[PDB]
Symmetry: C3
Subunit: 429 residues, 3 copies
């Protein structure tokens, strides 16, 4: 029988709503097909996930090892014994023996059963941890893919900005050849060509870094995805009821893992309680003995045997009690751990919801800003070409336009990362 306390799910340590459903599969959440191809490959070859799978097997084997301790043992024994005096008849005595013995703990108060149940729960927790690494990998690969695509896109706008600045410069040169501009405007147009080449070189770096990170995550080194057009429709962004319950969190693998750890701790309390109670063992044996080898295996020399035993703990100076206290304190630790895991999950979902609003509003504003800058550039050119304003007006408008384009790319990347983070924080596929 078991002395373990019954499982009780701790009180929800977070509000019941995120601020006032089930995810689709990742094959549906991700629209872009390239990212899905990379995710599938990662699921096969990624080393971290492979390691997480092996840890599940290990824990399964440890469960088996511990469970085995509940079953009877049967073992053989062989012995020979020479001995004699040191004075007063120096004749050697000699005896041979052979034992075949079985052993069995009755485990009436469930010590061994519960140590086993604890290992089974650790195994269950380990499977959940595995599931967590699985969804975190899907998230990470996808993000890594979009980071690569961001690098491509940044490189692309940098090159077309280079082309633009080269045209601007050629034009100012032509003007100068007609004694129509000045040497200041020319040097300004030349400068921005160089800073743009610098940006190009930077984006090449980031691309290479993105590629290398992606290949580490895949655990494979085949050809990388090429640049593709990517947008808000690349993901099927989560739609959520207005009063989505916090209870969705309890479905994440990492939270289920914590739950199983809590059950393991309950089982360890049962095991520690059992120590206070009598324990009954049983050993039975077939045995033989003889002073010489010849008549050893003689039925004549044989003996059967059957010996039940009971041990009764009486006083142990608070050993059992201290050990029980450790188990109880550790169960309390598991409860806090469970609470921490949920509070952390709640923070991830709340942040991603807030960030979704913030990022959408930043992007919208940034788009309107860009449109205004394009108009500004056009007006500045016209006014400059008619000698009404200095070339600094053109330079300034170009710089801001280019910076805004790079910022807008970064924001769209942040938006996709956040959508992926949200999906994942809700438990993924």
């Amino acid at each position: 029988c078991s002395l373990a306390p019954d499982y009780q799910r701790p009180a929800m340590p977070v509000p019941q709503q995120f601020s006032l459903y089930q995810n689709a599969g990742w094959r549906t959440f991700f629209v872009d097909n390239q990212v899905k191809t990379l995710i599938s490959e990662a699921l096969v070859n990624n080393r971290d996930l492979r390691m997480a799978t092996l840890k599940v097997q290990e824990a399964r084997a440890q469960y088996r090892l511990t469970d085995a301790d509940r079953y009877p043992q049967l073992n053989g024994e062989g012995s020979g014994s020479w001995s004699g005096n040191l004075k007063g008849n120096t004749a050697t005595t000699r005896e041979f023996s052979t034992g075949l013995n079985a052993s069995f703990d009755l485990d009436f108060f469930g010590r061994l059963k519960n140590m086993s149940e604890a290992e089974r729960q650790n195994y269950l927790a380990t499977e959940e941890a595995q599931r967590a690494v699985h969804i975190l990998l899907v998230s990470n690969v996808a993000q890594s893919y979009f980071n690569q695509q961001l690098a491509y896109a940044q490189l692309q706008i940098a090159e077309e900005t280079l082309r633009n600045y080269q045209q601007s410069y050629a034009f100012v040169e032509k003007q100068l050849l007609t004694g129509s501009s000045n040497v200041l405007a020319l040097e300004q147009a030349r400068g921005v060509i160089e800073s743009t080449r610098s940006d190009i070189a930077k984006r090449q770096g980031e691309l290479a870094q993105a590629n290398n990170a992606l290949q580490l995550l895949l655990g494979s080194y085949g050809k990388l995805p090429q640049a593709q057009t990517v947008n808000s429709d690349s993901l099927q962004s989560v739609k959520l009821p207005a009063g989505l319950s916090s209870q969705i969190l309890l479905q994440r693998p990492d939270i289920m893992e914590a739950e199983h750890a809590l059950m393991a701790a309950n089982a360890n309390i049962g095991a520690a309680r059992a120590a206070f109670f009598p324990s009954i063992s049983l050993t039975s044996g077939i045995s033989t003995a003889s002073s010489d080898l010849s008549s050893l295996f003689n039925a004549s020399s044989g003996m059967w045997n059957f010996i039940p035993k009971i041990e009764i703990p009486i006083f142990n100076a608070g050993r059992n009690q201290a050990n029980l206290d450790i188990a109880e304190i550790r169960q309390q630790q598991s409860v806090v751990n469970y609470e921490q895991k949920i509070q952390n999950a709640f923070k991830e979902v709340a942040d991603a919801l807030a960030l979704r609003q913030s990022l959408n509003d930043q992007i919208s504003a940034q788009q309107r800003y860009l449109a205004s800058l394009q108009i500004t550039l056009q007006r500045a050119r016209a006014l400059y070409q008619h000698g009404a304003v200095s070339y600094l007006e053109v330079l300034d408008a170009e710089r801001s336009l280019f910076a805004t384009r790079q910022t807008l790319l970064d924001l769209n990347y942040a938006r996709q990362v956040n959508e992926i983070s949200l999906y994942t924080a809700l438990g993924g596929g």
Copy 2:
């Protein structure tokens, strides 16, 4: 008796001065009352700290478990034994027995005593670690609070900057309606409205993130503090003698923790030394036996018993010596750990002192810069409105003014974080 070496505090691994006292309580260090209310709540509900408290209890129980091993044990035993031959009189022999036995290790050379002392020191170290989590939490909550307030303040100046830019734009529009300005100036004034809306949306994000981080730290989800006015007087910044001794560091909990770990290691050396010496045990028992159950508990079948024993290690192939070496090497590791903890603490205090000077000087300079920018803006407006300069003068002055205001807010936040870090690095309250 104990074979452990005496404790000796390692030579100070850092200079004796920080570069040429006792903290007040956090209730006094923090002036702002809101932050103190949040700190008090965190001290109650925060999960990390609760977990640190449970670890102290666990270590206390482990100390008790180990100490118990020093005391006598008294246990019961019950047995029944059926056995018989296999040929040549197949009559079964049967014997029942019941033992009540006491056990006691004399521990003359302090093996068990020292293993106990080691656990007591681990327990002491664990209390110190707890105290460390406690002061780190006070620090973190306070910082998290000021980060929230920074977000509020950034949002506030962004909105008033929005209002300003809308007035600027309305004015340029009016000018245009009088054929007095141009379409370039108008588009420039429009643009900055949009970039400011973008900043507003960003600050809303950061606010939401700040709120969520603060609630994670509190472990509670009641209403959040509203924006309040915050300044250098929100903290009672530490005043330090010119030649403050490094010795103040030895009062931090994390350093005391290291000290207790060092004592534990000393105790483990004592325990390992004891293994080389004889060990004396003592077992005494009341016992009975009979071939049938009826005359079992007969005083007739009973026997008392008393058996002192001594074990003497002679040769063990370097087992004891290797084990002693591990203990000695581990004590050396504890010494290095202690040194590392102090050197790290010294770095924290030195950095915060340097940062205090740097930040004060940056803020002072930035204030003078801001004042200059306000004047510049005013002059640019006047000159622009009289057709003496382009609107780019106004735009440029506005942009720099706004950026400087945001920078100044960030610097004041950094200053408070650094003051808090300094307080904490000196051991907190």
Copy 3:
């Protein structure tokens, strides 16, 4: 004998080339002599490395402890036994005994041998980890040194930029005193003085922080290096064949560490296999006994003794099999760990190669940009001083010039860090 599987190096988990040799010693790689002096000091006093050295000693001792378990033991025993009835002749029986006994496990199937070999391999792995900390420290010290030098250089250009801005301001003042400029230009020139003072204060902070980090790494607090002139020739940057083989990675200490861990796991498989097989032990003793102490050590009371024993596992409910499974699964884990270590190393080398190209191209472009900005500044001054353009042209050119200089310093630092990272990722000296 050993039941362990033979070592087989896992298939290379990365491409055979980095994208289409041996490092020199760090004394040769680093040209700058100051950095080498700091590296030498760190190698002596650094706490992390000292700790890594102690861990090697600890593992060596654990190897010795485990190996000792393979050798015979010889121990002494002394006993006295008083016992008597409880009724029916209350005369006490009394017996004294003294045993000297030897013990020896034959270890025919190599259980103990392999547990020893596992510990020897853990020791070997620990030496490699030590070597890793050693090369990582050389890297970190060098980087920390160049970061200090970066701080010095940033402070220096900030001060000369301050001097420049003060001259610019004095000039505008003079112009105003001749009713030749305006109050806008003056306030603009004043502003940039203040922002530059802010930068100066920031660089003082960073310098102080750099110094404190460097002293933590050195584990010593003597005088710090002063500013020196530093450039691309401070390091003898690695030259690599076009088709450098990935195989160079297998020379890194961290990868060799993984290899030894793999061998340890192989040994543990051997140990677990041995459990299925019979085990033969041997105990031999000299012994005495007597009812009184006087005739105790009488050769008369003495007995010699010799007892070989064999244990044969028959059925254990899958205990041995589960334990074997754990060992096999753990060996598979070591293989994955080995693969991870290599893939990670491959990423470090690939990133550093890409970054070397990117950084060189950014620096080249940034130099050309700087040269263009110097010309722009000169042209703007001339045009401004002749009333042809506003002072905003001068301000703008100064700001960009100063920002580009700071950026160029940061890029040169990044280049040196990357060269150091490359050297280190290839196995260092």
